[PDB]
């Protein structure tokens, strides 16, 4: 949380477009400069060479009680962030949802938990991030509790509307109220680093490069 | 102990671990082997379990064509029970894949051979003076899931499923139903149907 | 113990040897060399070189790393911060560093893959070392998975993982490992032309 109360904050398309050229590392270093951890440890890229940027649409699961359906609600440009207590014994994403995502402008799926139909996901080149791969259905194993509620994954809060950026290094949560400022800082981090890389690739010591830049 | 009909094996060749698991669920059976991951991207196998039990301190000549070797090494990470020699043997003798409760070596060879290997991970220390073959063609227990010699193994990118041989026809039939239904749902989704519309 | 240099021709001969062969050779001397859980992060890569060790501790050095080194970085197996990323990858490519082995995690995996740099670690993450972990010392002994790694040891890593070869035994282990592969080649060729495994062993 922040020094100001939480408020749903729209994020300009331009800020999202900029994230096309930003790595999770830059965004994480920017967040760190604001005193905030953003990484979701253990939530790994499952499809080589993929990445996504979009607005968190949150999904929270709970134990079966009763005594995929939510996906029709998810806006174009969303990254779905699903929390199932880090469970490895059932999956909360598969082929139907993947095909749906691809047909409905959904950018990627981040899972505190596991997914199935990995071959379809790979074949579709869909940006899936999860704690792993399994095949057993959610049916009679876990059930939807609520969507568009705050999630807490490894102590990191994800609010509906937060900026999600994911790549080969994993997933970063950027609070919506800070998104423009974090993206600005991340761009500056990338610029400084590019000069450092250019320097060491021209025979500078790292020592030299780091304090000329 | 029961052979499986060839037509059941043939149908299964176009089924997924998800379809088979959903079918098993409908019969009240868990099929999945948690933690036993695909080690070779893009591979799959369907075949008959030939079982191998190791114990703390070869058999391959006995393995029938069309077998999927399922080897239990108590989930150990300090030694391996599959490597290059066995991969090359499998490929020359119609062996369809290997599933290991434990780890495998010569991962680079397995990948280059496109061999369907499924394991708890990758390592290089040899079984020799670490683990020894105890028995073959005995029932195995992996993550509480029993595997009998003869059971139908189906393995892909999502992991490995054990289908009890005595029920294989019913499971495969149900699994085909699950798959046919989903194909229709996916078709409708691609033409722009809502998920609710598609499930109606 | 003694610091033991290793001839370039031994390194060159080791260039194509699989980690399985080196482990089998080590076993013949009664030595465990494998680092379980330290997994290849860049499909199809491998490295051979001399361990330059780096120890981190809870809350730079790379200019001191000789060409031909494999950097072995110990970070208590931590998953919350990374000790390798894009700057260091481009440094290694410009300075003849052969690969990096991490007891912990690395970032900028997409750059590392694109540079085809041989990286081995317990995984992938993006959070910086800054204000999370700090350099303790270099060229000190490390302990990873109960295996002691001395600066100067021969490191060999591939798809199957990472092997530590004690420098005093390195030349012997490489020669034995070559023998292992030659023996196995004859077996594989017998198998591939239709021999039983039994016949192929003899
Ligand atoms: Cl699905
Ligand atoms: Cl072997
Ligand atoms: Cl770096
Ligand atoms: Mg399906
Ligand atoms: Mg960077
Ligand atoms: Mg070999």
From TrEMBL, chain B:
GO molecular function terms noted in the UniProt entry: 4-hydroxy-4-methyl-2-oxoglutarate aldolase activity; metal ion binding; oxaloacetate decarboxylase activity
Binding site for substrate: 83-86, 105
Binding residues annotated for Mg(2+), in chain numbering: 16, 84, 106, 182
Cofactor: a divalent metal cation; Mg(2+)
Protein name: Putative 4-hydroxy-4-methyl-2-oxoglutarate aldolase
Domain of life from the UniProt record: Bacteria
Gene3D superfamilies documented for this protein: 1.20.5.3070, Ribonuclease E inhibitor RraA/RraA-like (3.50.30.40)
Pfam families for this protein: RraA-like (PF03737)
UniProt keyword annotations, A-Z: Lyase, Magnesium, Metal-binding
UniProtKB/TrEMBL annotation, chain C:
Classification via Gene3D superfamilies: 1.20.5.3070, Ribonuclease E inhibitor RraA/RraA-like (3.50.30.40)
SUPFAM superfamilies noted in UniProt: RraA-like
Keyword Cell cycle tagged: no
Entry keyword set: Lyase, Magnesium, Metal-binding
GO molecular function annotations of the record: 4-hydroxy-4-methyl-2-oxoglutarate aldolase activity; metal ion binding; oxaloacetate decarboxylase activity
Cofactor: a divalent metal cation; Mg(2+)
Keyword Metal-binding: yes
Chain sites annotated for binding Mg(2+): 18, 86, 108, 184
Source superkingdom: Bacteria
Residues that hold substrate according to the record: 85-88, 107
Protein name as it appears in the record: Putative 4-hydroxy-4-methyl-2-oxoglutarate aldolase
